Design a protein around this ligand. Structure first.
Ligand SMILES: *[C@@H]1O[C@H](CO)[C@@H](O[C@@H]2O[C@H](CO)[C@@H](O[C@@H]3O[C@H](CO)[C@@H](O)[C@H](O)[C@@H]3O)[C@H](O)[C@H]2NC(C)=O)[C@H](O)[C@H]1NC(C)=O
Ligand SMILES: *[C@@H]1O[C@H](CO)[C@@H](O[C@@H]2O[C@H](CO)[C@@H](O[C@@H]3O[C@H](CO)[C@@H](O)[C@H](O)[C@@H]3O)[C@H](O)[C@H]2NC(C)=O)[C@H](O)[C@H]1NC(C)=O
Ligand SMILES: CC1=N[C@@H]2[C@@H](O)[C@H](O)[C@@H](CO)O[C@@H]2S1
Ligand SMILES: CC1=N[C@@H]2[C@@H](O)[C@H](O)[C@@H](CO)O[C@@H]2S1
Lengths: 236, 54, 440, 52, 190
């Protein structure tokens, strides 16, 4: 007798999500709050009689994309109501839901992700990219190169669309990450991302990036950050 | 050099300059809208003098 | 009732002053009932095994009450040679790191520390016969070194745990660091008619060279008490040899022709004769065998290659059907990391999964997890090593039958929280926690 | 228990241990008796692991 | 031959005692010259990135003498959101290690810590209004981020020009919320 996602039919839920998100408002002084809305499984909602009534009550049919949209819009208002902006995973933008201008969309999927970059900025929403820099997804070899290589601005769109691309994120999901292998796994692999987002578009020279990174990796170690080595070598 | 990330403009000369630990000072310019009351900066000021030398 | 003592009784005698050898016996029985609490082993080395097993069987209730169970155990290793390779050339490893690595090998009942001391980028070993090797080879002749003192500590440390130390000074390949310090040793490669600044593998055409190795491997065999030495021979490149005209001349005189496989065989034979006359046996990577080198029938082939030239399970068949003893390392490459839990891939292997007779399969004496060091140093070593090499540890000790992944996961995760309680920086196996989280 | 023993017979019948008032002692008939370096240290190291 | 002083000059209204947002000007201009080197930036944030840049220019020479090449740097970020996503749900991250991550972001000019704080596996967040959320959803009672822990992170990230953007993922990834919130989670029938 397992459970499912949160129940969007009750207004216990939304009175709970209010008092809660009002607390978050006063705990975290940042303008934006990430709500998520990713990998939303419709398996359980579908097999629920009480929920199946709500679907006629509003005439959604059996399009659970809509019930999802409804829930996420009920929340977005709770946030806009409390003078906070919002960030949300790309599913929400992709199950057709109304977002108040200024709502951030974070792209995280590989499949035609520059096409997702196009849609999100064509529909006048600001975008964050995380898709290419999945840092939890480890592999043998100097994979810092693959993260250094990404050019976030390679997708369809007028110059006016590129202004809506504001930046990116390197993601270390903890499924296989905790205190024991975080610092090594993060750094210097994320430093690659760090230059990409800060430095000019035409800063791509591999030999120089290597040359500066190896020396930056040691300075990290010297400052007590246990960053892993790019390749055979040494510090001091 | 050693910069990471690489800034937007870096113009270097071969001419060297030397620093003194017990004689180097990070302080506010007299014409700056933040002074010795600035917690944030005062903190960094102390912290970095540590990193640079140490 | 309660228990106040463990009685430890060893039948075999050879003190506790000699170092363990390939033939040592690790059997023990652990019997804990009302009438008794007995750890009984054959050799002193079995007792260490027993003591580990014992530490792990201790436990405490939610109240915190230290308990041990009624337990009857008779145990022994499946394979005699259960090792761990460390590479201290691609990156230097502080002595503390090596000793700590031996503490964990203990808990995992590993019994051979394969020490890949030297290689292309680095020569961290200090030679007193040839001081200039370390002096012009190491990354930094003071900070990144192993002193005669350092090396004697590792050996004694390992011995105190029942770990044999297997030294590897890879030759003729992987020797770029030996180049400075001993001149002429390496082969100078050629463009077409004039040398091209680049140096190849150890030059087998010169007498100087064999005189060097003879002096040097006397030192090596003095310093490392274990009967066996690993002499390498992996990834030897013929490109630089063939390109050189002076060597080409040496090939004609002995009548070697055009294949440098037997030129290689000339070197190794001579090198195995040298090592053999100091009373040492030797392990060797598979290439020597694949390259049809004339090789002593007491040699040990370490199989490391997955596909080329033949499947690693076929390599094992070939090596054994030819009468040589085999180490398996191929599918246990801890340097090659991948997303998610690749420990299952290590655990799942079965070393005796090949076409062979009982006594032919009997030449497989164990194997080694390899932690090569290109991307690994002091900073990420521990978490990368454990508990992924523990999968191998059980594969090499436990019974052919113990293979159910769920039962493996249940224990290895419980073991991993125990590593944590013992100050080991072991990485997670999946989602979850240990109640006493790693914090240092 | 890692690695898994060859023959391990287990029970739920349990006994009490006393961290401090606990010792490892060689039987009289043992070939290895005090002076046995390997186990002289071992005994010390494992009582630190178990009850440090 | 000497650098005697680095003077930090804030051009515009400092924003000295504030929290940085998505539109915080992190641009600076650096001058390494004798006898007095000068760092200038409109806002406080620029000066943070500049003092970081400046730490990466001083070095010791062959003899351990502290040395900097005289140079002129002009620098602004290409992007304004440059973050790291950390997940403290799937495994609990001791507060000390989150701080070290910030320092390492400070060295790496990252300015956002996406703190994916909760998920299916555990609810480490100690809510003031809903105290049962952590009490029943967290891995254990020690595996919790009390208000003051969370306070400390935010004030620790401020002193390095990092914004803490928390994430409370909904409506999926919430199996832990219903450990301490009855009827909040859709029950699976069939
Ligand atoms: C240390 O543990 C090993 C493994 O249990 C002991 O070895 C095994 O002893 C058994 C019992 O005799 C051997 O089985 C015998 O084998 C012969 C043919 O080889 C068979 O015809 C007999 O009927 C009998 O079953 C077994 O071969 C042997 N080896 C292994 C690897 O299982 C060993 O005796 C123990 N050491 C001591 C001194 O207690
Ligand atoms: C040695 O004996 C003790 C005491 O009998 C054993 O302790 C106990 O461990 C068992 C098995 O894990 C626990 O029983 C149950 O675990 C299952 C599986 O999740 C769960 O469904 C049950 O509700 C219960 O928790 C038990 O709680 C615990 N203590 C008692 C009082 O039985 C111990 O496992 C034995 N050692 C070994 C290795 O056999
Ligand atoms: C955004 C994302 N949402 C999911 C996370 O909840 C998982 O933890 C992660 C596994 O690494 O995969 C995707 S990335
Ligand atoms: C034997 C072997 N010799 C080589 C080593 O020099 C490398 O470091 C290692 C990296 O995987 O690969 C093979 S294994």
């Amino acid at each position: 007798d397992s459970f499912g996602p949160i129940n969007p039919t009750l207004n216990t839920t939304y009175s709970f999500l209010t008092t809660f998100f009002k607390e978050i408002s006063e705990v975290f002084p940042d303008q934006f709050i990430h709500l998520g809305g990713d990998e939303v499984e419709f398996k359980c909602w579908e097999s629920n009689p009480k929920i199946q009534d709500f679907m006629r009550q509003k005439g959604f049919g059996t399009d659970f994309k809509k019930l999802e949209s409804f829930y996420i819009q009920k929340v977005l208002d709770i946030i806009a109501t409390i003078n906070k902006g919002s960030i949300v995973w790309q599913e929400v933008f992709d199950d057709k839901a109304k977002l108040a201008p200024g709502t951030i969309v974070e792209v995280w999927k590989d499949s035609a992700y520059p096409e997702e970059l196009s849609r999100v900025t064509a529909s006048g929403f600001p975008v964050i990219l995380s898709a290419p820099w999945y840092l939890d997804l480890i592999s043998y070899g100097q994979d810092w190169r693959k993260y250094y290589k990404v050019e976030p601005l390679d997708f369809g769109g007028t110059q006016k669309q590129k202004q809506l691309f504001i930046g990116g994120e390197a993601c270390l999901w903890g499924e296989y990450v905790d205190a024991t292998n975080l610092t090594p796994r993060l750094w210097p692999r994320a430093s690659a991302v760090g230059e990409r987002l800060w430095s000019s578009k035409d800063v791509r020279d591999m030999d120089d990036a290597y040359d500066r990174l190896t020396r930056h990796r040691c300075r990290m170690v010297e400052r007590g950050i246990a960053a892993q080595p790019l390749y055979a070598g040494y510090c001091n | 050099p050693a910069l990471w990330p690489l800034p937007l403009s870096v113009k270097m000369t071969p001419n060297l300059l030397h620093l003194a630990p017990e004689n180097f000072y990070i302080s506010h310019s007299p014409n700056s809208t933040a002074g010795p009351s600035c917690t944030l900066l005062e903190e960094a000021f102390r912290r970095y003098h540590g990193y640079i030398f140490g | 009732t309660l228990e106040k003592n463990v009685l430890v009784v060893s039948v075999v005698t050879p003190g506790c002053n000699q170092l363990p050898t390939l033939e040592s016996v690790e059997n023990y029985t652990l019997t804990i009932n009302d009438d008794q609490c007995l750890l009984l082993s054959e050799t002193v080395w079995g007792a260490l095994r027993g003591l580990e097993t014992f530490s792990q069987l201790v436990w405490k209730s939610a109240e915190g009450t230290f308990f041990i169970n009624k337990t009857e155990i008779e145990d022994f290793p499946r394979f005699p040679h259960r090792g761990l390779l460390l590479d201290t050339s691609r990156h230097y490893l502080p002595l503390s790191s090596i000793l700590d690595t031996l503490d964990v090998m203990a808990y995992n009942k590993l019994n051979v520390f394969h020490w890949h001391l030297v290689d292309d980028p680095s020569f961290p070993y200090e030679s007193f016969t040839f001081p200039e090797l370390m002096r012009k080879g190491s990354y930094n002749p003071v900070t990144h070194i192993y002193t005669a003192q350092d090396v004697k500590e590792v050996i004694e440390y390992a011995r105190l745990r029942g770990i044999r130390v297997l030294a590897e000074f890879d030759t003729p390949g992987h020797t770029l660091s030996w180049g400075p310090g001993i001149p002429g040793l390496l082969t100078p490669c050629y463009s077409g008619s004039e040398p091209s600044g680049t140096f190849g593998p150890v030059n087998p055409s010169l007498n100087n060279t064999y005189e060097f190795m003879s002096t040097f491997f006397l030192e090596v065999s003095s310093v490392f008490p274990d009967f066996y030495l690993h002499l390498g021979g992996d990834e030897v490149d013929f490109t630089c040899w063939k390109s050189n005209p002076e060597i080409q001349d040496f090939m004609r005189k002995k009548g070697f022709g055009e294949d440098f496989k037997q030129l290689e065989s000339f070197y190794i034979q001579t090198l195995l004769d040298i090592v053999s006359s100091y009373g040492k046996g030797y392990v060797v990577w598979q290439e020597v065998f694949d390259n049809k080198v004339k090789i002593q029938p007491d040699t040990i082939i370490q199989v490391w290659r997955e596909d080329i030239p033949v499947n690693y399970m076929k390599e094992l068949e070939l090596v054994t059907k030819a009468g040589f003893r085999a180490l398996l390392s191929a599918p246990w490459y801890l340097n090659r990391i991948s997303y998610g839990p690749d420990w299952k891939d290590f655990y799942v292997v079965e070393p005796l999964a090949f076409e062979g007779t009982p006594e032919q399969k009997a030449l497989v004496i164990g194997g080694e997890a390899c932690m090569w060091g290109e991307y690994v140093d002091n900073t990420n070593l521990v978490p990368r090593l454990w508990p992924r090499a523990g999968a191998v540890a059980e594969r090499l000790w436990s019974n052919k039958l113990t293979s159910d992944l769920t039962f493996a996961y249940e224990r290895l995760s419980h073991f991993r929280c125990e590593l944590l309680r013992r100050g080991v920086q072991a990485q997670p196996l999946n989602v979850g926690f240990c109640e006493q989280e790693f914090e240092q | 228990l890692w690695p898994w023993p060859q023959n391990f017979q287990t029970s739920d019948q349990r006994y009490v241990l006393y961290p401090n008032n606990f010792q490892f002692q060689y039987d009289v008939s043992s070939a290895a008796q005090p002076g046995c370096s390997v186990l002289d240290e071992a005994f010390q190291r494992y009582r630190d692991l178990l009850f440090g | 031959t000497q650098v005697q002083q680095l003077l930090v000059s804030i051009t515009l209204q400092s924003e000295c005692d504030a929290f940085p947002n998505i539109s915080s000007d992190e641009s600076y201009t650096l001058l390494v010259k004798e006898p007095v080197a000068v760092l200038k930036a409109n806002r406080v944030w620029g000066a943070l990135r500049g003092l970081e840049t400046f730490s990466q220019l001083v070095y010791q020479d062959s003899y351990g003498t502290f040395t900097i090449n005289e140079s002129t740097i002009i620098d602004s970020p290409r992007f304004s959101h440059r973050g790291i996503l950390i997940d403290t749900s799937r495994h609990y991250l001791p507060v000390k290690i989150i701080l070290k991550t910030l320092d390492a972001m400070a060295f790496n000019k990252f300015n956002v810590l996406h703190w994916h704080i909760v998920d299916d596996q555990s609810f480490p967040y100690q809510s003031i209004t809903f105290p049962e959320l952590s009490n029943k959803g967290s891995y254990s009672l020690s595996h919790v981020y009390t208000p003051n822990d969370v306070r400390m992170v935010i004030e620790y990230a401020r002193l390095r020009g990092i914004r803490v953007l928390p994430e409370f993922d909904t409506p999926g990834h919430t199996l832990s919320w219903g450990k301490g919130q009855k009827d909040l989670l859709t029950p699976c029938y069939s």
